[PDB]
């Protein structure tokens, strides 16, 4: 019995790794969560967090919870720039930055080859994987970032399967961004395989969480 304190961040901010939520990051175990209700240190790049409320009930009480580098940054993406993926929407102390548990892959020079990457849940608990899908504002923006005007993403486990394509469109400026980025997640059964495959627009997971969720409910309580 010992709650998870999120300070000025909400669940979204903490679990993505908004750069203001680095201080209190991983406590090992908790019975309920305390957060700041509708803080703007959730999603720094504008968009929609899909199945958000389901995730909150998921994360509210956990018996153990271990963060791990599911796709290590300097190893898993040899044909994709894993560095330029930063933005003034997600500022960290001077520079342009991004969420800590995802990477915004962009094209290397000229050419964005089909990526594909799998992870098998060896960890014995369930694994929480989160990822992002970027929707550029214009055709130019798409070709700048990914080259491939006609790009797709695919995420799949044995339970989950979705194909995303970017809706390219100029949306109201929020935090100087006219494009949008949606956030998704799935729990990976033990011994099951998650599979990413993309030709663009995929913000890949870097960190994932192996967790042992608790019986019934936790409770999430705001300041």
């Amino acid at each position, epitope marked *: 019995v010992a709650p998870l304190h999120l300070g000025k961040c909400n669940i979204a901010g903490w679990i993505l790794g908004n750069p203001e939520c680095e201080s209190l990051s991983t406590a090992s175990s908790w019975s309920y969560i305390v957060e700041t209700p509708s803080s703007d240190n959730g999603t720094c790049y504008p968009g929609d967090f899909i199945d958000y409320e389901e995730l909150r009930e998921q994360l509210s009480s956990v018996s153990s919870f271990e963060r791990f580098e599911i796709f290590p940054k300097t190893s898993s993406w040899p044909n994709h720039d894993s560095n330029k993926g930063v933005t003034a929407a997600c500022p960290h102390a001077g520079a342009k930055s991004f969420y800590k548990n995802l990477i915004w892959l962009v094209k290397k*020079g*000229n050419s964005y*080859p089909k990526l594909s990457k799998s992870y098998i849940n060896d960890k014995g608990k369930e694994v929480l994987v989160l990822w992002g899908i970027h929707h550029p504002s214009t055709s*130019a923006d798409q*070709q700048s970032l990914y080259q*491939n*005007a*006609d790009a797709y993403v695919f995420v799949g486990s044995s339970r989950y399967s979705k194909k995303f394509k970017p809706e390219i469109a100029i949306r109201p400026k929020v935090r100087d961004q006219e494009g949008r980025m949606n956030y998704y997640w799935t729990l990976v059964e033990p011994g099951d395989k998650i599979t990413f495959e993309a030709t663009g627009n995929l913000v890949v997971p870097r960190y994932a969480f192996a967790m042992e969720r608790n019986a019934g409910s936790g409770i999430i309580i705001s300041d």
Partner: antibody
Amino acid sequence: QVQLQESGPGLVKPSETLSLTCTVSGGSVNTGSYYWSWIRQPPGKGLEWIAYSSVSGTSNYNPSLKSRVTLTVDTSKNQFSLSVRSVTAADTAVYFCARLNYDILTGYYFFDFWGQGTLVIVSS
Amino acid sequence: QVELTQSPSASASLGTSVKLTCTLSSGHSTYAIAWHQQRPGKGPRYLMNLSSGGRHTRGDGIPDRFSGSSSGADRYLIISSLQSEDEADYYCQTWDAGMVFGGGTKLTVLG
């Protein structure tokens, strides 16, 4: 196997509309990660890209000619077609049709099959 | 978007290697390209594509003696054991917002 071949008039009067048609054998304009493209070479000079379209996905045009070109694909006849409006002598060229290969695995975009090319003179 | 620069002409003797050059514009040195050959009065023929770090991948039925490499912004097409049927214009092409070509390099084969 894969062959492209151009067809249309050899001659067009100024401000009329130039209209060619490529015809693909050895393959289908529906299948594949491909775009169907047009390139011209005015006499004595280099290759200029005009535009491409695919059946499904996005078309792409050379900005200084976008306003005057229209591309169409005829799935059934295995043909695609270029239409350039308001021609002048500066549109005099050999027009080539070609397959632009979006090779998914590398992300490269390279013309791997070219037509024999057809000459179009723009003269009154 | 990118530009390609090829000097217009090259010459070399039968039997030698020749090294044709394509130069990517400043700020595009990581780009990849393709190479094409246009013998006189014919259509072009795709020869190979070429990565920024020198990996060349020939088209179908293009002989072994065609190859390629890279140094910075330059992209090379090596033709070894040069033969008199290699006399042709060689265009490089790449892609960015659009498809772009080099101006071509007319190779003359001497000997």
